[PDB]
Design a protein around this ligand. Structure first.
Ligand code: NA
Length: 635
C-alpha cells in the first residue's frame, strides 16, 4: 500500500498507469480503522490489476476538497487520473470485491446484471403484446419464445384449434377454412374450401406438412381484436400458400381462417381450386402467362415468408416471396385480415418482365430467380425500410456448393409502403435480369449490407462462436422508443446450430439504418436521442479502436469471416494505424463521420460487451456503396 501525501498525489495518482484505489481517512474515525485491514488484504489479492493508496486527510488538507470528499473513509477509484467510481464507508471485504469486480475490466460475466438465455427459433418474427408488456417471436416449425427484456427468452408452443379440438394435429389444422364467404363489390361471394396441405401435396409424392410450416408473421388486427398468424405452408414445384390463422390470445390456440395467397397453379384447371377467380373473375382457361411449366420461378413467386404490417395511414399490406420471381406485395382487408378482393392490379410488363400481375400483385424486389427471401418492412424515422435476406440459410463451408450458406441481410428504403425500394445509391431492389447477387462470384451488389459474417469481435463473437449466415430478420420500432433488429444466426464451428440475436438500430444523419455492433444488453439510449444529444463527449473519443468492415462478396464456401484491424483515432481528427483517414463529429448530436478510402456516416454510442459488464464507445457507419463499418474502444 502506497501511503501518499498531497504533493505526491499528482504523480502517484493522476500520473498512474493502471487503476488506483484511494482511501481518504483520518485519525478520529472508527470506520477508517475497521477498513484498514480489509484494504491490506485487497492489496494482496488484487496485485495484478490495481494499486491501493491512502491519504491521511489530517496531514493533507489539500487533496480531498477537490474531489468533494465528505464522509470518511471515502474510497476513490482513479482511472489514469480521473474518478471512475466512488464509495463511502467501512465496506466489508465482500462489498469491496463486488465493487472492484464491477469497475475493473477483465472480470468476466460474474458482475454483469443481465442474463442472455438463448433460444433457437428459426426465422424469428417479433411482436409486442401490450396486455402483458411482453415481446414474442414466432418462427418456423412452430417454434415460439417470449421475453420481457430481449435478453432472456423462454420457448413455448402455441396450440392449433379446429372445430372439434383445442390442441389439433398439424395434419388436420389447415384443411377447412373457418371463413365461407368474403366481400367483393361489397356483396358476399363464396370463398374456396381450400385445404393448404392437399394443395402443397400436389408438388410431390408422400407429402407431410410437419417440416413445411415456415416463417409465420404474427400481428394484432385492430378491427377484429384478434392476434393473426400468417403462416407459409410450403410444397415443392411452387405449390405453396400463405394462410391466416387467428386467436383471442397471442399464445393460441390459433384457428385456420383461410388462404391469403396461393401459388403454383401452372397446370390445367387447378386454378379452380384456388381464389384465382375471386381475384380475376370467372376464367374459362388458365391465362397463358401462368402456363410456365418448370420455368415458373423466372416469373412468379414461391408463396412463402409473409410480412404483414399496417402502413402509416392504417392500411394493411402483405409482402411475400422467396427467390424465384421475387418479392411481391398485395393489399389486405383491414376488417378480415384476408386479401382485399376489391383491389385491382393492372398487368404491367410481359413474360419474365412482368412487374405487376393481376393475381400476385406488385413486385417490390428480386425477379429472374435471383436470391432474396424473408422480406420485411417497418416504418422507422420517416421512411419505410425493406429488408431482404440474400444467399443460402446453411452455415456454409462446402467448397463445391455455392448455395450452401451465404445468408446476409440487405436493406432498402422508400417514402411509400409499396415502393419503389431503393438502396443508398438509388438502385432498385427489383432486378431487370438474372444476376448472381451474393457471395464471392457476385456480379451485383445492391442494398445496404447491414452486417455480414464476422469474428474476433468483442467477448462473444469469437472462435467457434463467430457469427455467420445471419438473416431472416424482423425489426420493430418499439413502444419504448428503441428499434430492435431480431434475426437468427449460425456460427463458425457449431454445425448447423442457430440462435436468436437482437441488436439495437439507429439512423445516421442521412436517415439510413446503422446496427449497434453488439447485442442489446439494456442500454438506455433511445432512437430520438441520436439527433438531439451527444452520447459520447468529443474529448473522450480519441484512442485505440478495433475497426471491422463488412464487405460484399465474402466466400461462405470456405466460411470466410470479416475480422477487425487496429486503428487509432487521434484527438486532432486523424486516423492512423492499419489505415489512414480522418474522423469528425457533429457537436450536440451523436453523429460521426469516418473518412477512410471513402466517407462513412454513422453514430457513436456506449455499448456493453456481452456477456461481461465491460463498456465501450462504439461507432457504426455506412457508405452509399452499401458497405458498413463498426469500431470499438474499451472505455
Ligand atoms: Na419474415
Amino acid at each position: 500500500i502506497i501511503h501518499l501525501t498531497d504533493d505526491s498525489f499528482d504523480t502517484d495518482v493522476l500520473k498512474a498507469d493502471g487503476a488506483i484505489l484511494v482511501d481518504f481517512w483520518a485519525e478520529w474515525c472508527g470506520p477508517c480503522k475497521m477498513i484498514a485491514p480489509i484494504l491490506d488484504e485487497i492489496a494482496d489479492e488484487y496485485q495484478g490489476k490495481l494499486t491501493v493508496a491512502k491519504l491521511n486527510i489530517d496531514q493533507n488538507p489539500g487533496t480531498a476538497p477537490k474531489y468533494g470528499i465528505r464522509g470518511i473513509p471515502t474510497l476513490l477509484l482513479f482511472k489514469n487520473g480521473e474518478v471512475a467510481a466512488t464509495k463511502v464507508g467501512a465496506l466489508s471485504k465482500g462489498q469491496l470485491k463486488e465493487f472492484l469486480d464491477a469497475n475493473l475490466a477483465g472480470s468476466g460475466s460474474g458482475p454483469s446484471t443481465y442474463e442472455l438465455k438463448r433460444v433457437s427459433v428459426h426465422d424469428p418474427s417479433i411482436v409486442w403484446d401490450p396486455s402483458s408488456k411482453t415481446y414474442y417471436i414466432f418462427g418456423s416449425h412452430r417454434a415460439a419464445a417470449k421475453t420481457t427484456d430481449l435478453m432472456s427468452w423462454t420457448a413455448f408452443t402455441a396450440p392449433w384449434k379446429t372445430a372439434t379440438s383445442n390442441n389439433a394435429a398439424n395434419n388436420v389444422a389447415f384443411e377447412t377454412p373457418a371463413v365461407k364467404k368474403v366481400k367483393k363489390g361489397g356483396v358476399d361471394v363464396d370463398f374456396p374450401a381450400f385445404s393448404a396441405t392437399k394443395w402443397s401435396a400436389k408438388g410431390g409424392s408422400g407429402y407431410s406438412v410437419d417440416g413445411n410450416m415456415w416463417a409465420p408473421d404474427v400481428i394484432y388486427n385492430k378491427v377484429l381484436k384478434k392476434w393473426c398468424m400468417y403462416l407459409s405452408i410450403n410444397g415443392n414445384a411452387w405449390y405453396s400458400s400463405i394462410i391466416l390463422l387467428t386467436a383471442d390470445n397471442i399464445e393460441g390456440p390459433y384457428l385456420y381462417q383461410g388462404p391469403v395467397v396461393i401459388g403454383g397453379f401452372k397446370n390445367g384447371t387447378e386454378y379452380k381450386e384456388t381464389d384465382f377467380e375471386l381475384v380475376l373473375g370467372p376464367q374459362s382457361s388458365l391465362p397463358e402467362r401462368y402456363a410456365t411449366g418448370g420455368k415458373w420461378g423466372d416469373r412468379y413467386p414461391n408463396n412463402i415468408d409473409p410480412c404483414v404490417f399496417y402502413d402509416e395511414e392504417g392500411k394493411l399490406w402483405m409482402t411475400y416471396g422467396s427467390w424465384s420471381g421475387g418479392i411481391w406485395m398485395i393489399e389486405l382487408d383491414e376488417n378480415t385480415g384476408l386479401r382485399d378482393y376489391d383491389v385491382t392490379y393492372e398487368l404491367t410488363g410481359s413474360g419474365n418482365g412482368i412487374t405487376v400481375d393481376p393475381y400476385f400483385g406488385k413486385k417490390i424486389a428480386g425477379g429472374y430467380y435471383v436470391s432474396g427471401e424473408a422480406s420485411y418492412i417497418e416504418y422507422i424515422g420517416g421512411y419505410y425500410f425493406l429488408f431482404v435476406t440474400y444467399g443460402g440459410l446453411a452455415a456454409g463451408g462446402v467448397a463445391s456448393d455455392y448455395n450452401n450458406g451465404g445468408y446476409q441481410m440487405r436493406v432498402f428504403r422508400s417514402e411509400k409502403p409499396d415502393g419503389p425500394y431503393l438502396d443508398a445509391r438509388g438502385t432498385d431492389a427489383v432486378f431487370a435480369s438474372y444476376k448472381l447477387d451474393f457471395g464471392p462470384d457476385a456480379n451485383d451488389n445492391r442494398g445496404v449490407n447491414i452486417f455480414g459474417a464476422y469474428g474476433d469481435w468483442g467477448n462473444q463473437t469469437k472462435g467457434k462462436n463467430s457469427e455467420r449466415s445471419q438473416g431472416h430478420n424482423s425489426i420493430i420500432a418499439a413502444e419504448d422508443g428503441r428499434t430492435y433488429l431480431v434475426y437468427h444466426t449460425r456460427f463458425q464451428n457449431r454445425g448447423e446450430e442457430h440462435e436468436v440475436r437482437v441488436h439495437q438500430v439507429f439512423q445516421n444523419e442521412d436517415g439510413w439504418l446503422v446496427a449497434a455492433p453488439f447485442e442489446y444488453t439494456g442500454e438506455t439510449v433511445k432512437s430520438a436521442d441520436i439527433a438531439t444529444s451527444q452520447q459520447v463527449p468529443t474529448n473522450k473519443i480519441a484512442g485505440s479502436y478495433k475497426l471491422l468492415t463488412h464487405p460484399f462478396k465474402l466466400d461462405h464456401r470456405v466460411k470466410e469471416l470479416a475480422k477487425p484491424v487496429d486503428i487509432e483515432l487521434n484527438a486532432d481528427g486523424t486516423i492512423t494505424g492499419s489505415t489512414t483517414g480522418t474522423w469528425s463529429v457533429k457537436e450536440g448530436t451523436s453523429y460521426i463521420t469516418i473518412n477512410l478510402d471513402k466517407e462513412y456516416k454513422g453514430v457513436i454510442v456506449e455499448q456493453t460487451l456481452e456477456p461481461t459488464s465491460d463498456k465501450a464507445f462504439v461507432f457504426t457507419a455506412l457508405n452509399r456503396n452499401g458497405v458498413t463499418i463498426w469500431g470499438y474502444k474499451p472505455i
